Design a protein around this ligand. Structure first.
Ligand SMILES: Nc1nc2c(ncn2[C@@H]2O[C@H](COP(=O)(O)OP(=O)(O)OP(O)(O)=S)[C@@H](O)[C@H]2O)c(=O)[nH]1
Ligand SMILES: [Mg+2]
Lengths: 164, 305
């Protein structure tokens, strides 16, 4: 099972991956360039092989991110719920990109940093993500926090489900 | 499988200045993927000739170039954004080398002049967005200099009320790059005269009757703009245009700028928070320092007559 993670700079992709499988945070924020490791996950009465491909949110690495897409079964389209701008970029930058390079992949829409969602604020809602999930044809929208340890397993259990 | 220079190819191909940030084991993975994709791209093209998903067929730069002679639509424009933003250096080099830019420029003219509608602003803006990716390649700026009315078209496009402050910046950055490209950047002794190219385009706006005075619309963009990237970039262009080898030609270009309010504009910026930025403080100082040396020189010649 090949899973690739895309989204804007600083929305919490690295943290998402390392919390799911460590499960903690790197303390020091270092912008991703490329990262790739496998990791075994116990789900049902069997173990699974998860090949994780972390990518760069930053524009500087645009001509290189496609090197991560080949043969991807699932792509995680990530934004941060307290960052509408990252949310908008899913449909202008991220989806169009993976649809161009690896249209055979299933997509999971992932709302990151839910722990930080204030109210009265212009943040993204579970409603908006669910709706986008519908327009984009993702398998599911799943909210998560690497900091409060929420949805982590959920996110990666789904990546497996949509493959069985 | 220890070398490991076989990556410096992928590196410059993807525009990566610091590969030292990649763990050796990773840039082997990346090499296998690079090679794998070169093979993948090949298969899709020979295949989409019949499928026929043009979306995959235009991953041939030559094919993309030829298609623009016939297609100018949102779909194609959107796909081109993806392609040019995320492709390899050499994919653009090839596109440009086979026409490509002149073809995209023609479409851009059509878009700039199209009658107003809802789809009009967007169609024009995608164009800017696509051009902004071709121009990240030097060969593209070389190609632009040789297109009749290319720089002029950029100047006109830059004055469109249909585009965004960011669009206007990207075009300016492309004009400025052109203005400084006297010689081919990657060929020893090959004159290109981009400096003269841009100068003429500014003279042509005057003589086609679009600028009431030389430099007016550019200068007026510069004047109200609030980007600070744009103030700086505008200063760089101005100083480049004034930076001429002959005193006669500096005294002349700078006079045109004096004639339209430049001096009073900079002096207002000196009494302003603008000086807090070193890129801009130095450009403004350069202007005055060069204006003063020229006064002394002029005085000095008069003194000998
Ligand atoms: N409050 C909160 N902060 C988070 C969460 N996840 C990541 N962050 C913070 O946001 C910053 C970005 O996290 P990170 O995972 O490294 O972003 P990224 O998506 O990988 O960014 P890039 O590599 O594409 S540039 C980090 O400093 C981290 O502390 C989260 O779930 N909750
Ligand atoms: Mg990261």
């Amino acid at each position: 099972l090949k899973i690739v993670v895309v989204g804007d700079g600083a929305v919490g992709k690295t943290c998402l991956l390392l919390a799911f499988s460590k499960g903690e945070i790197p303390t020091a924020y270092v912008p991703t360039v490329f990262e790739n490791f496998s990791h075994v996950m116990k789900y049902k009465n069997e173990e699974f092989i998860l090949h994780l491909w972390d990518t760069a949110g930053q524009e500087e690495y645009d001509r290189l991110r496609p090197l991560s897409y080949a043969d991807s079964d699932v792509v995680l389209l990530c934004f941060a719920v307290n960052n509408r701008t990252s949310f908008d970029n899913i449909s202008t930058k991220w989806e169009p990109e993976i649809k161009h390079y690896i249209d055979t992949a299933k997509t999971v829409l992932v709302g990151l940093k839910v722990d930080l969602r204030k109210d009265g604020s212009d943040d993204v809602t579970k409603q908006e993500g669910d709706d986008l999930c519908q327009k984009l044809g993702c398998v599911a929208y799943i909210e998560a926090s690497s900091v409060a340890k929420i949805g982590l397993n959920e996110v990666f259990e789904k990546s497996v489900d949509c493959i069985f | 499988e220890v070398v490991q220079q076989k990556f410096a190819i992928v590196a410059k191909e993807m525009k990566i200045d610091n590969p030292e940030l990649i763990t050796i084991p990773n840039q082997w993975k990346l090499v296998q993927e690079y090679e794998k994709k070169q093979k993948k791209d090949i298969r899709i093209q020979l295949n989409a000739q019949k499928t026929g998903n043009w979306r995959n067929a235009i991953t041939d730069p030559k094919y993309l170039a030829d298609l623009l002679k016939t297609r100018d639509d949102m779909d194609l424009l959107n796909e081109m954004v993806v392609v040019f933003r995320s492709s390899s250096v050499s994919f653009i080099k090839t596109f440009v080398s086979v026409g490509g830019l002149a073809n995209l420029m023609a479409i851009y003219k059509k878009k700039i002049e199209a009658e107003n509608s809802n789809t009009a602003i967007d169609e024009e803006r995608k164009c800017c967005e696509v051009l902004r990716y071709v121009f990240a390649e030097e060969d593209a700026t070389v190609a632009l200099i040789e297109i009749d009315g290319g720089v002029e078209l950029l100047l006109k496009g830059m004055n469109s009320k249909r585009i965004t402050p960011d669009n206007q910046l990207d075009i300016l950055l492309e004009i400025t790059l052109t203005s400084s490209m006297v010689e081919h950047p990657s060929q020893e002794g090959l004159y290109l005269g981009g400096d003269v190219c841009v100068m003429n385009a500014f003279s042509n706006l005057v003589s086609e009757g679009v600028d009431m005075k030389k430099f007016l619309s550019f200068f007026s963009l510069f004047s109200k703009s609030k980007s600070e990237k744009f103030k700086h970039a505008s200063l760089v262009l101005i100083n480049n245009l004034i930076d001429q080898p002959e005193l006669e030609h500096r005294m002349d270009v700078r006079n045109s700028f004096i004639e339209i309010g430049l001096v009073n504009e900079l002096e207002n910026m000196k009494n302003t928070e603008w000086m807090k930025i070193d890129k801009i403080k130095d450009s403004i100082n350069d202007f005055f320092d060069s204006w003063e040396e020229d006064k002394k020189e002029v005085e000095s010649r008069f003194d000998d007559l």
